[PDB]
Enzyme design. Sequence first.
Site, PDB file in Angstrom:
ATOM      1  N   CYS A   1       0.678  -1.322   0.086  1.00  0.00           N
ATOM      2  CA  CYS A   1       0.050  -0.096   0.120  1.00  0.00           C
ATOM      3  C   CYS A   1       0.630   1.301   0.007  1.00  0.00           C
ATOM      4  CB  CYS A   1      -0.992  -0.043   1.323  1.00  0.00           C
ATOM      5  SG  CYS A   1      -1.945   1.477   1.208  1.00  0.00           S
TER       6      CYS A   1
ATOM      7  N   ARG B   1      -0.160   4.525   2.952  1.00  0.00           N
ATOM      8  CA  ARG B   1      -0.152   4.410   4.419  1.00  0.00           C
ATOM      9  C   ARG B   1       0.155   5.478   5.233  1.00  0.00           C
ATOM     10  NH1 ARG B   1       3.801  -0.676   4.908  1.00  0.00           N
ATOM     11  NH2 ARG B   1       4.603   0.229   2.812  1.00  0.00           N
TER      12      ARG B   1
ATOM     13  N   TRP C   1      -9.038   6.428  -0.369  1.00  0.00           N
ATOM     14  CA  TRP C   1      -9.320   7.353  -1.710  1.00  0.00           C
ATOM     15  C   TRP C   1      -8.494   6.577  -2.692  1.00  0.00           C
ATOM     16  CZ3 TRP C   1      -8.305   9.438   3.023  1.00  0.00           C
ATOM     17  CH2 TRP C   1      -7.285  10.073   3.261  1.00  0.00           C
TER      18      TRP C   1
ATOM     19  N   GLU D   1      -4.656   4.300 -10.545  1.00  0.00           N
ATOM     20  CA  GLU D   1      -5.578   3.079 -10.533  1.00  0.00           C
ATOM     21  C   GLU D   1      -6.591   3.040 -11.541  1.00  0.00           C
ATOM     22  OE1 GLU D   1      -5.943   1.685  -6.358  1.00  0.00           O
ATOM     23  OE2 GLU D   1      -5.780   3.594  -5.803  1.00  0.00           O
TER      24      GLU D   1
HETATM   25  C1  HEM Z   1      -5.966   6.463   2.065  1.00  0.00           C
HETATM   26  C2  HEM Z   1      -6.036   6.211   0.871  1.00  0.00           C
HETATM   27  C3  HEM Z   1      -5.443   4.845   0.157  1.00  0.00           C
HETATM   28  C4  HEM Z   1      -4.514   4.795  -0.837  1.00  0.00           C
HETATM   29  C5  HEM Z   1      -4.199   6.293  -1.607  1.00  0.00           C
HETATM   30  C6  HEM Z   1      -4.135   3.702  -1.178  1.00  0.00           C
HETATM   31  C7  HEM Z   1      -3.308   3.411  -2.191  1.00  0.00           C
HETATM   32  C8  HEM Z   1      -3.083   2.114  -2.633  1.00  0.00           C
HETATM   33  C9  HEM Z   1      -2.782   1.415  -3.906  1.00  0.00           C
HETATM   34  C10 HEM Z   1      -2.379   2.256  -5.079  1.00  0.00           C
HETATM   35  C11 HEM Z   1      -2.565   0.297  -3.921  1.00  0.00           C
HETATM   36  C12 HEM Z   1      -2.123  -0.714  -4.715  1.00  0.00           C
HETATM   37  C13 HEM Z   1      -3.401  -1.710  -5.303  1.00  0.00           C
HETATM   38  C14 HEM Z   1      -3.487  -1.812  -6.891  1.00  0.00           C
HETATM   39  O1  HEM Z   1      -2.495  -1.213  -7.469  1.00  0.00           O
HETATM   40  O2  HEM Z   1      -4.404  -2.505  -7.103  1.00  0.00           O
HETATM   41  C15 HEM Z   1      -2.965  -0.121  -2.392  1.00  0.00           C
HETATM   42  C16 HEM Z   1      -2.906  -1.509  -1.936  1.00  0.00           C
HETATM   43  C17 HEM Z   1      -3.346  -1.702  -0.548  1.00  0.00           C
HETATM   44  N1  HEM Z   1      -3.993  -1.121   0.201  1.00  0.00           N
HETATM   45 FE1  HEM Z   1      -4.009   0.783   0.176  1.00  0.00          FE
HETATM   46  N2  HEM Z   1      -4.696   2.915  -0.238  1.00  0.00           N
HETATM   47  C18 HEM Z   1      -5.449   3.653   0.601  1.00  0.00           C
HETATM   48  C19 HEM Z   1      -6.078   3.217   1.906  1.00  0.00           C
HETATM   49  C20 HEM Z   1      -6.002   2.168   2.251  1.00  0.00           C
HETATM   50  C21 HEM Z   1      -6.443   1.488   3.434  1.00  0.00           C
HETATM   51  C22 HEM Z   1      -7.382   2.600   4.430  1.00  0.00           C
HETATM   52  C23 HEM Z   1      -6.353   0.256   3.945  1.00  0.00           C
HETATM   53  C24 HEM Z   1      -6.527  -0.597   4.829  1.00  0.00           C
HETATM   54  C25 HEM Z   1      -7.494  -0.368   6.111  1.00  0.00           C
HETATM   55  C26 HEM Z   1      -5.436  -0.292   2.781  1.00  0.00           C
HETATM   56  C27 HEM Z   1      -5.005  -1.286   2.610  1.00  0.00           C
HETATM   57  C28 HEM Z   1      -4.305  -1.936   1.563  1.00  0.00           C
HETATM   58  C29 HEM Z   1      -3.830  -3.104   1.142  1.00  0.00           C
HETATM   59  C30 HEM Z   1      -3.760  -4.033   2.108  1.00  0.00           C
HETATM   60  C31 HEM Z   1      -3.170  -3.089  -0.015  1.00  0.00           C
HETATM   61  C32 HEM Z   1      -2.343  -4.192  -0.587  1.00  0.00           C
HETATM   62  C33 HEM Z   1      -3.363  -5.346  -0.771  1.00  0.00           C
HETATM   63  C34 HEM Z   1      -4.079  -5.497  -2.373  1.00  0.00           C
HETATM   64  O3  HEM Z   1      -4.458  -4.556  -2.639  1.00  0.00           O
HETATM   65  O4  HEM Z   1      -3.261  -6.671  -2.961  1.00  0.00           O
HETATM   66  N3  HEM Z   1      -5.203   0.956   1.868  1.00  0.00           N
HETATM   67  N4  HEM Z   1      -3.156   0.919  -1.713  1.00  0.00           N
HETATM   68  C1  LIG Z   2      -8.260   0.683   0.008  1.00  0.00           C
HETATM   69  C2  LIG Z   2      -8.025   0.998  -1.054  1.00  0.00           C
HETATM   70  C3  LIG Z   2      -7.650   2.276  -1.522  1.00  0.00           C
HETATM   71  C4  LIG Z   2      -7.047   2.356  -2.962  1.00  0.00           C
HETATM   72  N1  LIG Z   2      -6.766   3.479  -3.311  1.00  0.00           N
HETATM   73  N2  LIG Z   2      -6.844   1.203  -3.660  1.00  0.00           N
HETATM   74  C5  LIG Z   2      -7.286   0.127  -3.228  1.00  0.00           C
HETATM   75  C6  LIG Z   2      -7.007  -1.025  -4.415  1.00  0.00           C
HETATM   76  C7  LIG Z   2      -6.619  -2.445  -3.752  1.00  0.00           C
HETATM   77  C8  LIG Z   2      -6.479  -3.337  -4.908  1.00  0.00           C
HETATM   78  N3  LIG Z   2      -6.377  -4.675  -4.412  1.00  0.00           N
HETATM   79  C9  LIG Z   2      -6.006  -5.607  -5.761  1.00  0.00           C
HETATM   80  C10 LIG Z   2      -6.129  -7.205  -5.253  1.00  0.00           C
HETATM   81  C11 LIG Z   2      -7.027  -7.805  -4.459  1.00  0.00           C
HETATM   82  F1  LIG Z   2      -8.295  -7.631  -5.134  1.00  0.00           F
HETATM   83  F2  LIG Z   2      -6.675  -8.832  -4.043  1.00  0.00           F
HETATM   84  C12 LIG Z   2      -7.357  -6.752  -3.377  1.00  0.00           C
HETATM   85  C13 LIG Z   2      -7.511  -5.329  -3.688  1.00  0.00           C
HETATM   86  C14 LIG Z   2      -7.694  -0.146  -2.210  1.00  0.00           C
END
Ligand code: HEM
Ligand SMILES: Cc1cc(N)nc(CCCN2CCC(F)(F)CC2)c1
Lengths: 412, 412
Positions: B109, B112, B281, B286
Amino acid sequence: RFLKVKNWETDVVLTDTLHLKSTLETGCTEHICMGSIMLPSVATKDQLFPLAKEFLDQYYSSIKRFGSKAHMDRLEEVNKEIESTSTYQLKDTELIYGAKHAWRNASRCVGRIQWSKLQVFDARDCTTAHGMFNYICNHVKYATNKGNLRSAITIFPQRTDGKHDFRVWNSQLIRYAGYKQPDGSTLGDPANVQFTEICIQQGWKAPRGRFDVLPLLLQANGNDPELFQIPPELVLEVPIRHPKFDWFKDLGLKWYGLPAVSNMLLEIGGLEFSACPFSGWYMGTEIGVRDYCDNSRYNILEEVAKKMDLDMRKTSSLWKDQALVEINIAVLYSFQSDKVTIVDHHSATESFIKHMENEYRCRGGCPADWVWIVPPMSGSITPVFHQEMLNYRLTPSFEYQPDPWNTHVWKG
Amino acid sequence: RFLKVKNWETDVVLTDTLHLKSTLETGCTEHICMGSIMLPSVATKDQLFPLAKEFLDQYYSSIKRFGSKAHMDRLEEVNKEIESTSTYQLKDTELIYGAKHAWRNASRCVGRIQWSKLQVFDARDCTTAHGMFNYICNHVKYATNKGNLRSAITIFPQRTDGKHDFRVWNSQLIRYAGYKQPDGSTLGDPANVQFTEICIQQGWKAPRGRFDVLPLLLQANGNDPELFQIPPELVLEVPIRHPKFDWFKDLGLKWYGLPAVSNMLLEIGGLEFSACPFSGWYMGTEIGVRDYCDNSRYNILEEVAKKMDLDMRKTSSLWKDQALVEINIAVLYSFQSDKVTIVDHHSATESFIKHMENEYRCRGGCPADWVWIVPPMSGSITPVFHQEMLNYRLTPSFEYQPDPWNTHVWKG
Ligand code: HEM
Ligand SMILES: Cc1cc(N)nc(CCCN2CCC(F)(F)CC2)c1
Ligand code: HEM
Ligand SMILES: Cc1cc(N)nc(CCCN2CCC(F)(F)CC2)c1
Ligand SMILES: C[C@H](O)[C@H](O)[C@H]1CNc2nc(N)[nH]c(=O)c2N1
Ligand SMILES: C[C@H](O)[C@H](O)[C@H]1CNc2nc(N)[nH]c(=O)c2N1
Ligand SMILES: [Zn+2]
């Protein structure tokens, strides 16, 4: 034991068994991954024979004569020579195979579809810095081939004791000079400010401008290095213009045609070649993105944005992104319009996927470093972004080595 | 033992000791790195107490009461409850800490820097799919906050035996439907063609168009899942327009404001929360890069290139790159002009570097996945490209879990 890598754009799966032949260590452990670390971290005679045998067994396996009489005799012949001399010498055929598979095994190289078309120049009879200059000049002329670039490597004598090392002190055969200023900024290429000064130390007279080709600093058989100017007729350069924006010539940018690494070490059968300059052709982004637009390199996004009339107040206007693409359309266009070989990051990454397929089919795998294979712009619109890759270390290989000026015992 | 990560754009070095607290395994070994593998690969009572103790020792260390009387009594209190029940229950304060540090520890993420500003909704008293719908609706309304997006998580009852699992079957609370055609192509979002069909199986009536918001498929206490339509007044959407190209509205694209993951598993002190939708957000790329321009997603580079009048014959005209940037200037502009929170990949990656600094200073490290942190466009012109990152697995954490329809023992 038989690992699987998936492509998440085509759902193609491939099975890797080549990694079992891997030998060296990655830097990663079961509890920490170092895949984004740039450089994770004398040779005696006992250690040399397994390395020689390992290499000999795969060379003869490759000419379809594994374990035959000719193999076992050369096995015996090299063992006896390692007993006698505590080292050994490669046949011309073993050197050409070794060099080609060091490239094939280069997990950070996106260009490896070409690996078997490598021209190998044996310079192991070289003894002086002048001899080195002459060999390097013939490499530069051959590899350039009037802009129909040809990939090649020149291999100077292997390391023996350690204090008799052949080294090219330049990081690339052809690089632009970097001069800092009295007012603290930088003219030319900031990457080479240190090397540009070492040349001045040893006696170079700088034409303190922008794209000034550096001289060669060549070290023979451990001796202190010496300066030579590549004949300028041998340095092919491309002036950068844009196919739409006629103000682009006013920028007055140019780049050299030949990417030619000279600071790495070639390992073949446990032998170490500390000077082995190799060259290919550029992928566009290396110049247009890293060279031109890195903050600590030429750093031209400032001016290209100005001349395009862009909203430079707000970060979110993506003006950096917008000027980045124009710069790379221009590098490609300029090189192609001059018939100087170049590849765009789309064609290069497609070819690598196709190369990856061939490797898994006929070799059981392809070591690949995702962090380095995905290009520095438009990553996800290229097929390597969606390709899972296993990184592992095979031999023969190219390795990093410390810069010579940190390790060389000088004598005034 | 005390590893170092370097930034190659500023020469800043940071020392990581947090990785020593790491516990789980990466998938990498000393001889193979799996840093580009997307998903590398019932709980008994013996295993639960060390996990509980480990988590309790860091919660009380965080409120500056490590090893005090209140700590040792809750240690004893949870041990006795694991003896008695073979499981245990978190206090509200431990759940809020656990959820916040699962996000803090999320190495993939880039957002964070916000981790401590998370709103935690305790839905552990939920018993039915209707209750789930109501909780999720209140999450959607709170997190959206009229476009001033607020990050939040809703946490349904923890797993007990395994056949009584709460699950959200959607991969995200808000997603667009994907319908294949009789002529073989796809309308809407191809990612969800499978899920869009499961909804039709269970009884959904599809408005077979483009941006049709999917219904919720909610499973309570192991029971077969049930369909609910989010009130459309609760689904905030942004129509995409360009600040220069008035033909951009004709494209008729829009996206939802709330990114809200619902298919992952929350692990706190060895307890498993199979349904824990969390939302933040969007970072612009994305939507503009992955959602809009992946070959197996909406795949609009075709049309944006047409309407811009671009040379689409030659790969090396970089027309894909040129249309990619326009699309992302438009996603940003549209969201900001509607006061719907969004962050551009430049601001987001700067903030992550600054977050990384804070973590190494006051925590000893920051687990980070370079492959996922570097954005999918203009990578090297963002500071995270040049930042070395150590990836390791800390707990509490979010983990992947199989899709429910592969594992659910149905009953007609
Ligand atoms: C606050 C604004 C946030 C932004 C701008 C953000 C941005 C991102 C981005 C760009 C990714 C890559 C996901 C992808 O490319 O598909 C990511 C992954 C992730 N986010 Fe954040 N996120 C946010 C909030 C959060 C929150 C609130 C949580 C959990 C409470 C969270 C948990 C995760 C996790 C666990 C991943 C990696 C797991 C996955 O998506 O495979 N995110 N985030
Ligand atoms: C909270 C949040 C914010 C953000 N800006 N973007 C995301 C995208 C997470 C994408 N991730 C892809 C693999 C999955 F499906 F396994 C779990 C979701 C999540
Ligand atoms: C044929 C055309 C070639 C192309 C298009 C190409 C492309 C690339 C690129 C883009 C990189 C990443 C380097 C960077 O981003 O700085 C790379 C790395 C590398 N190349 Fe290739 N290359 C070519 C030829 C060769 C040849 C002929 C050799 C060796 C004989 C070679 C050996 C390597 C090695 C060892 C690396 C990784 C080491 C490093 O640079 O850190 N390449 N290549
Ligand atoms: C042969 C070749 C072709 C090409 N297209 N590009 C290159 C660039 C290699 C860059 N690499 C950077 C780190 C280093 F200096 F350590 C070694 C050189 C080389
Ligand atoms: C093959 C590769 O692991 C896969 O495409 C990854 C690469 N990096 C990514 N990074 C982000 N942020 N999101 C992704 O989906 C991916 N996909
Ligand atoms: C920190 C990171 O390892 C470093 O910036 C790497 C990332 N990937 C790269 N990839 C290529 N091709 N060339 C590079 O110089 C780098 N630099
Ligand atoms: Zn690793």
